[PDB]
Tab-separated table of C-alpha atoms in Angstrom:
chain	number	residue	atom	x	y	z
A	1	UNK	CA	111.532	128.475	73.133
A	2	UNK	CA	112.896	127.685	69.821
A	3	UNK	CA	110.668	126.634	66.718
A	4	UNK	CA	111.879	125.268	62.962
A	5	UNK	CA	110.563	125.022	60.332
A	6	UNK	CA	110.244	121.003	58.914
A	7	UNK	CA	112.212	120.636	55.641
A	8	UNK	CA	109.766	117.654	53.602
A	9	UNK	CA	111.374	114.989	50.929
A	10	UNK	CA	108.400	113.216	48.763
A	11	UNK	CA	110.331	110.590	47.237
A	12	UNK	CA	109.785	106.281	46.221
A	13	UNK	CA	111.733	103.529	47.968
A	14	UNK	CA	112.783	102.536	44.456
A	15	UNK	CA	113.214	104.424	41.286
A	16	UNK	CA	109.695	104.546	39.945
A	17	UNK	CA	108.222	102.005	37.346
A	18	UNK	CA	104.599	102.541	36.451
A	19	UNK	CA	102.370	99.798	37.334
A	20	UNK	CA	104.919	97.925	39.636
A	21	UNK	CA	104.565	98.035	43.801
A	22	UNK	CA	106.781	100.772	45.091
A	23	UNK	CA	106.510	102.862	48.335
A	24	UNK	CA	105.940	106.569	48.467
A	25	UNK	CA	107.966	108.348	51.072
A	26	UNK	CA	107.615	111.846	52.994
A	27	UNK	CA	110.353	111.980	54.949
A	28	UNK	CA	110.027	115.378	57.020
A	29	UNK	CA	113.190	116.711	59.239
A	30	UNK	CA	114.687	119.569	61.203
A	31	UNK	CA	111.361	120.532	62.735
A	32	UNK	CA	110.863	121.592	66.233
A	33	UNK	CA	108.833	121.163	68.799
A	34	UNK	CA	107.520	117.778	67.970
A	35	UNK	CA	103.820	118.137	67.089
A	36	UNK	CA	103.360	117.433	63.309
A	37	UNK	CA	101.101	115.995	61.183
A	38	UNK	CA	102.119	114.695	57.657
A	39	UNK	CA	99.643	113.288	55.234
A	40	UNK	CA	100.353	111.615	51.701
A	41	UNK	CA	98.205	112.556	48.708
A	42	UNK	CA	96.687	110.865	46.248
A	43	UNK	CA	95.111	112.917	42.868
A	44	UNK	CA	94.613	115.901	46.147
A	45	UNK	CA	92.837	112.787	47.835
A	46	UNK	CA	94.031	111.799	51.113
A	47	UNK	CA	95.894	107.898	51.995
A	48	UNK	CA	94.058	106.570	54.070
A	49	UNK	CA	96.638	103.691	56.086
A	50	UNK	CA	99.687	105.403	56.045
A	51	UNK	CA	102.579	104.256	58.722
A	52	UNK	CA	105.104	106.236	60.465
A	53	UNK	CA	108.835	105.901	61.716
A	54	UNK	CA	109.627	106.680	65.711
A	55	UNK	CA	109.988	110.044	66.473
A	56	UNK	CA	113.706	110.690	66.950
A	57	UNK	CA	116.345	113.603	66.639
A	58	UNK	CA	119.449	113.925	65.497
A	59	UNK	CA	122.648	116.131	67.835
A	60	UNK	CA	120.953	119.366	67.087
A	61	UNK	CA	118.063	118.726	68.956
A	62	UNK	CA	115.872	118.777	65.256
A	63	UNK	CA	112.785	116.507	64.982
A	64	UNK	CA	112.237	113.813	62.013
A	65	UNK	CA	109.962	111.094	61.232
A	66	UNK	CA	109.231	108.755	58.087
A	67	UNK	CA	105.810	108.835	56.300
A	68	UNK	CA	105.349	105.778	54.080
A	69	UNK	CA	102.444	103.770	52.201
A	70	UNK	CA	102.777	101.540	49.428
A	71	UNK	CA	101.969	102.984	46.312
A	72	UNK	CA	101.824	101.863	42.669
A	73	UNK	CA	103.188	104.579	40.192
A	74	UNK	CA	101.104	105.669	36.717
A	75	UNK	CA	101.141	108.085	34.277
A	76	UNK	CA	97.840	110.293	35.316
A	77	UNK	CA	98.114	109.384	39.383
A	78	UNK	CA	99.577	112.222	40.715
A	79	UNK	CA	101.214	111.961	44.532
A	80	UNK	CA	102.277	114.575	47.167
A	81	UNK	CA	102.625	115.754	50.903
A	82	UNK	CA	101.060	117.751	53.325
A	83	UNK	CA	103.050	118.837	56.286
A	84	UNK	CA	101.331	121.184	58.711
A	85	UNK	CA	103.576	122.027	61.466
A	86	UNK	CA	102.922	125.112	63.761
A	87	UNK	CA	105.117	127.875	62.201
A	88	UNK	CA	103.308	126.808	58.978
A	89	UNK	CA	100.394	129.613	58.606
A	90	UNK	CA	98.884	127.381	55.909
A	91	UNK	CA	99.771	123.561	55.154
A	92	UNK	CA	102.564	122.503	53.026
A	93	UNK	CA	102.021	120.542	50.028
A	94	UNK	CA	105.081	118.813	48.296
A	95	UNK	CA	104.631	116.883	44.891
A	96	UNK	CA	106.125	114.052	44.099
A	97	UNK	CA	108.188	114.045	41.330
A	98	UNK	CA	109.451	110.214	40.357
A	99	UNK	CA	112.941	112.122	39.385
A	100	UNK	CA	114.082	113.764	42.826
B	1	UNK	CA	134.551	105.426	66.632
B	2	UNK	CA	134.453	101.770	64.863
B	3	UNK	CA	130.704	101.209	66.171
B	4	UNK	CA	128.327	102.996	68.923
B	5	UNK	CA	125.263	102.491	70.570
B	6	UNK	CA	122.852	105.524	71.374
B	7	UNK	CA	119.479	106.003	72.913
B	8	UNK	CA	116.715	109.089	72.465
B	9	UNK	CA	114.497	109.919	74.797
B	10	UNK	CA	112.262	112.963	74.416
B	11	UNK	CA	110.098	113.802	77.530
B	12	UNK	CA	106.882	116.249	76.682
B	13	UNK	CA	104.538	117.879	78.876
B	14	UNK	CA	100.941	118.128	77.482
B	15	UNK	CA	99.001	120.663	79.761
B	16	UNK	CA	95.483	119.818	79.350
B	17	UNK	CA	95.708	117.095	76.941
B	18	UNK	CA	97.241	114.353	79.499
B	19	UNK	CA	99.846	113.769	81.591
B	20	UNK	CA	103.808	113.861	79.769
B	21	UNK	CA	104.569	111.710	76.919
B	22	UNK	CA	107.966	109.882	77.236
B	23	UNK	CA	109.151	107.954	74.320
B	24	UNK	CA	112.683	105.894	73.710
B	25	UNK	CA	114.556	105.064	71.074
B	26	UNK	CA	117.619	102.736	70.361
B	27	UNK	CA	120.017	102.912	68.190
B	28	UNK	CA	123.449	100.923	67.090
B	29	UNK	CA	124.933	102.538	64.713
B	30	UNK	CA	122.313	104.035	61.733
B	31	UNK	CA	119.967	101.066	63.046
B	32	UNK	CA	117.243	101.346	65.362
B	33	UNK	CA	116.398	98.709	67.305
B	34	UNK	CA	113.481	99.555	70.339
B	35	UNK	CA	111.071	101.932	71.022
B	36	UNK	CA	108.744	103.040	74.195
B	37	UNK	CA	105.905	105.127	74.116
B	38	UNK	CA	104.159	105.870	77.855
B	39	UNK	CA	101.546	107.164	75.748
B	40	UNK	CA	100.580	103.815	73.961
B	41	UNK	CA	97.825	101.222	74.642
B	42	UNK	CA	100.023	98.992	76.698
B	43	UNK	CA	103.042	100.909	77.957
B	44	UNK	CA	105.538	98.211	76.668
B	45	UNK	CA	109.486	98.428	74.580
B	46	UNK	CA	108.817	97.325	71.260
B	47	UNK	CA	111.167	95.732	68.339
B	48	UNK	CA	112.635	97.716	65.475
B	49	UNK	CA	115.079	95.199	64.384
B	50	UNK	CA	115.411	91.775	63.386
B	51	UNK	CA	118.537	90.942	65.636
B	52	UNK	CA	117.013	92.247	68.499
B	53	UNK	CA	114.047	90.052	68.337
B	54	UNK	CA	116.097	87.235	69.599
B	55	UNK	CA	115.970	88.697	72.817
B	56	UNK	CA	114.211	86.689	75.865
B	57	UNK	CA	110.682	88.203	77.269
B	58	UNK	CA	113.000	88.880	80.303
B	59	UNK	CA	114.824	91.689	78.373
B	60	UNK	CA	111.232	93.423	77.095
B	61	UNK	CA	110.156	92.886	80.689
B	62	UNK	CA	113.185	94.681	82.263
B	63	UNK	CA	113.298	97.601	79.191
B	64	UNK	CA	109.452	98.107	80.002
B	65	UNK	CA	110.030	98.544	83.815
B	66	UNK	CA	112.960	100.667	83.893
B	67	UNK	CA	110.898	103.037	81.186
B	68	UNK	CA	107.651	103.318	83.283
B	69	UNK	CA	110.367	104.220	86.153
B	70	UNK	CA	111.865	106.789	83.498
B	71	UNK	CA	108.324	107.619	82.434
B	72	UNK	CA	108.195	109.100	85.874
B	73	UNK	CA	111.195	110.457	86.777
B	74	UNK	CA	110.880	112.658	83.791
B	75	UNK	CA	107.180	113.633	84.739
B	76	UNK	CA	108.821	115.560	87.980
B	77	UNK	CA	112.024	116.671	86.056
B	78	UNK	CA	109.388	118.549	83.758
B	79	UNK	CA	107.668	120.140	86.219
B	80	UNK	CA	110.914	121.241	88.090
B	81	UNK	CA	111.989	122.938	84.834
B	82	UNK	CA	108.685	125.312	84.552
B	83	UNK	CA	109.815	126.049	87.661
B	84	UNK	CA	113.285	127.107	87.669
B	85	UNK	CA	112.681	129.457	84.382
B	86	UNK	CA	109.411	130.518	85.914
B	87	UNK	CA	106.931	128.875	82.914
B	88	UNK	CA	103.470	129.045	83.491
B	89	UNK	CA	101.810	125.342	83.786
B	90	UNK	CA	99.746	125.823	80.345
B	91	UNK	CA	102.131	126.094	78.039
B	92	UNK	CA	104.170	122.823	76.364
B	93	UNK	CA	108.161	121.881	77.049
B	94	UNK	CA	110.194	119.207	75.831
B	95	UNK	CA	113.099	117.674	77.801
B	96	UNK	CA	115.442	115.805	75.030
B	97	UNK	CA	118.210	113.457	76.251
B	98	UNK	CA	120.677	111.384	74.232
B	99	UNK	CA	123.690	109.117	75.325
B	100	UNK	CA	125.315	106.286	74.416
B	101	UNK	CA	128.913	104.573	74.034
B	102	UNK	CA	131.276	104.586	71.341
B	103	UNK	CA	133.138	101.307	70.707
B	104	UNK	CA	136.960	101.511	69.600
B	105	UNK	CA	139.060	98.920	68.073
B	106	UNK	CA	140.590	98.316	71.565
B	107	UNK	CA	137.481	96.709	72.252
B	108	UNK	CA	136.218	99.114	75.322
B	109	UNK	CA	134.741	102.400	75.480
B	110	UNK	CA	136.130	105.239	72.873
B	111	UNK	CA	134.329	107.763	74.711
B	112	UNK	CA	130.913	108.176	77.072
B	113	UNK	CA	128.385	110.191	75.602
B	114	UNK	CA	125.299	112.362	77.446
B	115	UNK	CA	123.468	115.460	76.136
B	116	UNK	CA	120.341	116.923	77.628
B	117	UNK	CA	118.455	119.596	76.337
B	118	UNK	CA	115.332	121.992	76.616
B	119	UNK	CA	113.006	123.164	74.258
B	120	UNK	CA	115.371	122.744	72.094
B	121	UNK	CA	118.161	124.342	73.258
B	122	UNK	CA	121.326	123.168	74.954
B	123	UNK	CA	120.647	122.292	78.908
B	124	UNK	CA	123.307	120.463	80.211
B	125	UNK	CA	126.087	117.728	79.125
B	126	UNK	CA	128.592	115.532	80.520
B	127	UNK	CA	132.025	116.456	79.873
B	128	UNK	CA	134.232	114.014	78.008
B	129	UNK	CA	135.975	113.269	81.336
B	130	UNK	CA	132.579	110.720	82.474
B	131	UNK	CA	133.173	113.118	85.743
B	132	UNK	CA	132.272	116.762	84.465
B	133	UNK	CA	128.952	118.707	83.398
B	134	UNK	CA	128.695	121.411	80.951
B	135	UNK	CA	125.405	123.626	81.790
B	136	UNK	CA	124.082	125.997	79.560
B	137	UNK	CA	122.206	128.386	81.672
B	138	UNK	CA	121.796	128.990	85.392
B	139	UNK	CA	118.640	126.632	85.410
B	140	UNK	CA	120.757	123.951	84.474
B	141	UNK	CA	123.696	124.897	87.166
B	142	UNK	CA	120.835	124.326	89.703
B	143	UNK	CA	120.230	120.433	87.951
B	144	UNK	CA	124.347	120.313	87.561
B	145	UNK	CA	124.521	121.219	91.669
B	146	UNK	CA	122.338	118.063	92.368
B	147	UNK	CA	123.470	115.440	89.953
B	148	UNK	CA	126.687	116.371	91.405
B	149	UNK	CA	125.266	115.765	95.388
B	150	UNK	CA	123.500	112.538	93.288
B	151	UNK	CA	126.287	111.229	92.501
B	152	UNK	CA	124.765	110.646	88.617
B	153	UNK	CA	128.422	111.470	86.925
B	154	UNK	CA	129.812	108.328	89.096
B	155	UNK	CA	127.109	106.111	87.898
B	156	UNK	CA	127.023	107.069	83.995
B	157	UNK	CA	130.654	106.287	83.965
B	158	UNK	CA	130.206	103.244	85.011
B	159	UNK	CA	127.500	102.248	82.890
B	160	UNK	CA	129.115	104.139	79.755
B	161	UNK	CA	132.816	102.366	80.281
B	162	UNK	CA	130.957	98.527	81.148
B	163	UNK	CA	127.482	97.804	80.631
B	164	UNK	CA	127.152	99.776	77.673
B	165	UNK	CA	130.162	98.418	75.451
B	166	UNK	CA	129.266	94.917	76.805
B	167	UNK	CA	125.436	95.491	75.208
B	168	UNK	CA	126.814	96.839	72.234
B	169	UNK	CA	129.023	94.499	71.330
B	170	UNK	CA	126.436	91.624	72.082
B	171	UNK	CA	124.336	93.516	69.173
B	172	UNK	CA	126.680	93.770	66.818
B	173	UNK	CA	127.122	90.233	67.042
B	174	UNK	CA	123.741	89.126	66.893
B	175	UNK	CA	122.846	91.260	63.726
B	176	UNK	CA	126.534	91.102	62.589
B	177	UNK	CA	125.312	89.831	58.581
B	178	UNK	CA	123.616	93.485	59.065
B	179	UNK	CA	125.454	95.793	61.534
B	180	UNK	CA	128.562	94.533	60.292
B	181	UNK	CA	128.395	94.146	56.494
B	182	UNK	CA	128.518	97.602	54.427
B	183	UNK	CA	125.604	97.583	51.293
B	184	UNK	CA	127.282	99.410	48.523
B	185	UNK	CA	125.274	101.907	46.725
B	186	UNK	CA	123.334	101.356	43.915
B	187	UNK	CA	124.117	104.189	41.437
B	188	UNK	CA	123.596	105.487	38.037
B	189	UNK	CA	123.070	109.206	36.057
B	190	UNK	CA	120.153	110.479	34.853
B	191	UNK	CA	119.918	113.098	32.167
B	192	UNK	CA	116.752	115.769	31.702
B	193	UNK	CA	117.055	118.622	29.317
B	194	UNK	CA	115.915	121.633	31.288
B	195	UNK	CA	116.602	123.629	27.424
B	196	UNK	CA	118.238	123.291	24.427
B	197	UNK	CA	121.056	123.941	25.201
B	198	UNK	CA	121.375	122.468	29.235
B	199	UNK	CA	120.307	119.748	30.952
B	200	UNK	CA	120.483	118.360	34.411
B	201	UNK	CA	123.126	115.393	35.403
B	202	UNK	CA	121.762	114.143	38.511
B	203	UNK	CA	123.827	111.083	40.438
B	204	UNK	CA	121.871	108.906	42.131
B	205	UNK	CA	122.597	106.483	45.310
B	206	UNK	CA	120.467	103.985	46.414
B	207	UNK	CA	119.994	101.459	49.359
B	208	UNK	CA	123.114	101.607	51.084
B	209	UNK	CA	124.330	101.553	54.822
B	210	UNK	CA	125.839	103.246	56.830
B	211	UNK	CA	124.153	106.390	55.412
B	212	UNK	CA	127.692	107.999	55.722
B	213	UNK	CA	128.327	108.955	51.848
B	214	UNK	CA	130.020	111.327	49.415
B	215	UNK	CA	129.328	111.727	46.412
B	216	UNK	CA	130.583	115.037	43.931
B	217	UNK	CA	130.042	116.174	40.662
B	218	UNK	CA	133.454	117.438	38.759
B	219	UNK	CA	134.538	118.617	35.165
B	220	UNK	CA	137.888	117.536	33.414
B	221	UNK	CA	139.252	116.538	37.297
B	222	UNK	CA	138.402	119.925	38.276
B	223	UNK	CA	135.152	120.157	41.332
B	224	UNK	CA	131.522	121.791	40.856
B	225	UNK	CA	131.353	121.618	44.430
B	226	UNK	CA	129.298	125.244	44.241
B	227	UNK	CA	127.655	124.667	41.266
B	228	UNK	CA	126.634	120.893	42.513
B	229	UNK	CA	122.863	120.490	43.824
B	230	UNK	CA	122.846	118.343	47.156
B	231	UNK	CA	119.963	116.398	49.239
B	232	UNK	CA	119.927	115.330	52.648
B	233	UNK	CA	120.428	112.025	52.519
B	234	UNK	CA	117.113	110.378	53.255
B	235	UNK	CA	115.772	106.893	54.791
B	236	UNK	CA	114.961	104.585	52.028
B	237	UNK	CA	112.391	102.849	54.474
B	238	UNK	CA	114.072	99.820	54.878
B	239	UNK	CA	117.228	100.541	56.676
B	240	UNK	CA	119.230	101.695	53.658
B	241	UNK	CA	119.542	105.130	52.707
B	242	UNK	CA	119.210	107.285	49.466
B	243	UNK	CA	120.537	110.658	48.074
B	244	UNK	CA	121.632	112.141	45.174
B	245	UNK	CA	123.961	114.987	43.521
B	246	UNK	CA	122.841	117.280	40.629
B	247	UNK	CA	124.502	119.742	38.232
B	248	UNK	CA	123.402	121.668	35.239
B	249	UNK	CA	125.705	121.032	31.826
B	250	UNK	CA	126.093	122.708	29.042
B	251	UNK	CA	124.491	120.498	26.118
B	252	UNK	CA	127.951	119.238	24.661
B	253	UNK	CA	129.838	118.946	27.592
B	254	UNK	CA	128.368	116.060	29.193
B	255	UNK	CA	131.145	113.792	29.033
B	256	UNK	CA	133.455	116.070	31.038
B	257	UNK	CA	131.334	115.742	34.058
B	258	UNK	CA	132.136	112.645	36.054
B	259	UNK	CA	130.451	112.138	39.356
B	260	UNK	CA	132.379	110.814	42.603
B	261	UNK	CA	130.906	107.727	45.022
B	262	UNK	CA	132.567	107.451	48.543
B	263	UNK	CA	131.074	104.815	50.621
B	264	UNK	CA	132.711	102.308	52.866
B	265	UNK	CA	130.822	99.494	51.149
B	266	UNK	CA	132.816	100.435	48.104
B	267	UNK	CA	136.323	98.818	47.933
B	268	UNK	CA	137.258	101.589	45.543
B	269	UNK	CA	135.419	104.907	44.980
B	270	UNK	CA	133.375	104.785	42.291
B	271	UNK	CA	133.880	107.310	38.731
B	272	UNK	CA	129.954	107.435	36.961
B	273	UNK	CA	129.404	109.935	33.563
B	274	UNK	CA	126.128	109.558	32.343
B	275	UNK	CA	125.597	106.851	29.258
B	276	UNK	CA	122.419	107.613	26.060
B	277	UNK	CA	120.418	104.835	26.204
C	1	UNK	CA	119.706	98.002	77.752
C	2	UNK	CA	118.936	101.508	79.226
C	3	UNK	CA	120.848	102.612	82.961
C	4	UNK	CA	117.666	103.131	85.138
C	5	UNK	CA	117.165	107.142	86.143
C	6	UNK	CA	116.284	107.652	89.405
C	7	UNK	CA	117.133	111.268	89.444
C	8	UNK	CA	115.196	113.860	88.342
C	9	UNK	CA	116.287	117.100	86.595
């Protein structure tokens, strides 16, 4: 019974403009078993319609998926990621910066 | 080797929460095309990909039907595993499986491809040969002894060295503007002092495909290779793929740092150095 | 298309 620990991304579809339709992206890998849940933040707010890739795995057996919405970048919204996995004893959160 | 096509299936047993959850994927190449889920409102193989919506009802009909047999199959393989490592029925297990063919210029099969595994770990695989398994533990010498009395190497084979390569090379045809065209990346060098006196280089790649891409940072011809910050490369969201290559400079040296694009959708590697606007 | 498995682990 092996667990890992689910390495998170929080990036944009396209390098980030303010005021211009991009899409926010969480893309969370290398976790194991399968049970995750991955939300996208808004100003600590929660997205509400969010979609999801297909679970898949690459040759090492490791878990990833593909957390998206679309999202409209500004200079006070602030965006990030919560990843709770089960070897997490607390939720991750990763921000979003518009330059990684 | 010049193309492949590879499926994912993940098996899970949910003690009580419901009955196990087996879900599919396709794949051709860094392109998904299908997906079943026996866990959705309609258990039914569903369309990732433009090219393969060209596909008659027949084919969704047949996919569907040979996954609700699947679906099944797997629901006894689960419980057969508890058993041979002696798991209690109230805890969770996941079966993984993932084969597929890869094409070579000759036109046929390159080689057959079939790995299993078990929460997590290595179970058993079949051995380049199409003939030979690999197990991993005894449990899986006890699965080995009956797809061997099954007769399941004999029928891979022949599905890996015909059926398969046939498929696949039906797909790359249909979605050949796509599967068959590289996308160039989309590149350029952004500059953030993290002091006065450094600041970070970071080379970016954007939208390309296949996601198979190298890009280095390097100083005067000579590599940063440990000094150079690397991401995974990530899903875009669209099919294309991003990542991107940092390195901390020296305020002055700037211009000695040139990063390195590799790409197949690049007739010539690309040479970037970051430009003041 | 997916080979149809008939035989269980």
């Amino acid at each position: 019974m092996i667990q890992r620990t689910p390495k998170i991304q929080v990036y944009s579809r396209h390098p980030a403009e303010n005021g211009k339709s991009n899409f926010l992206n969480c893309y969370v890998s290398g976790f194991h078993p399968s049970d995750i849940e991955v939300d996208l933040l808004k100003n600590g707010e929660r997205i509400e319609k969010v979609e999801h890739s297909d679970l898949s795995f690459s040759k090492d057996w490791s878990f990833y998926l593909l957390y998206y919405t679309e999202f409209t970048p500004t200079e006070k919204d602030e965006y990030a990621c919560r990843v709770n996995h089960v070897t997490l004893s607390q939720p991750k959160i990763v921000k979003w910066d518009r330059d990684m | 080797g010049s193309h492949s096509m590879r499926y994912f299936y993940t098996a899970m047993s949910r003690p009580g929460r419901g009955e196990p959850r087996f879900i599919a994927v396709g794949y051709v190449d860094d392109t998904q095309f299908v997906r079943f889920d026996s866990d959705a409102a309609s258990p039914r193989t569903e369309p990732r990909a433009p090219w393969i919506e060209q596909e008659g009802p027949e084919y969704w009909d047949r996919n569907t039907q040979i996954f609700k047999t699947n679906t099944q199959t797997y629901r006894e393989s689960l419980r057969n595993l508890r058993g041979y490592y002696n798991q209690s029925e109230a805890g969770s297990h996941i079966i993984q499986r993932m084969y597929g063919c890869d094409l070579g210029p000759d036109g046929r099969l390159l080689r057959g491809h079939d790995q299993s595994a078990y929460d997590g770990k290595d179970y058993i695989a079949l051995n380049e040969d199409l003939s030979s398994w690999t197990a991993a533990d005894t449990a899986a010498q006890i699965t080995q002894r009956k797809w061997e009395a099954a007769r399941v190497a004999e029928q891979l084979r022949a599905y890996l060295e015909g059926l398969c390569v046939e498929w696949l090379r039906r797909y790359l045809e249909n979605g050949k503007e796509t599967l068959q065209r590289a996308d160039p990346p989309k590149t350029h060098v952004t500059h953030h002092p993290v002091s006065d006196h450094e600041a970070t280089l970071r080379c970016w790649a954007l939208g390309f495909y296949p996601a198979e891409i190298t890009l280095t940072w390097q100083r005067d011809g000579e590599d940063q290779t440990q000094d150079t910050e690397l991401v995974e490369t990530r899903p875009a969201g669209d099919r294309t793929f991003q990542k991107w290559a940092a390195v901390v400079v020296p305020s002055g040296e700037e211009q000695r740092y040139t990063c390195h694009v590799q790409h197949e959708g690049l007739p010539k590697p690309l040479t970037l150095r970051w430009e003041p606007s | 298309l997916p080979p149809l498995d008939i035989t269980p682990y």
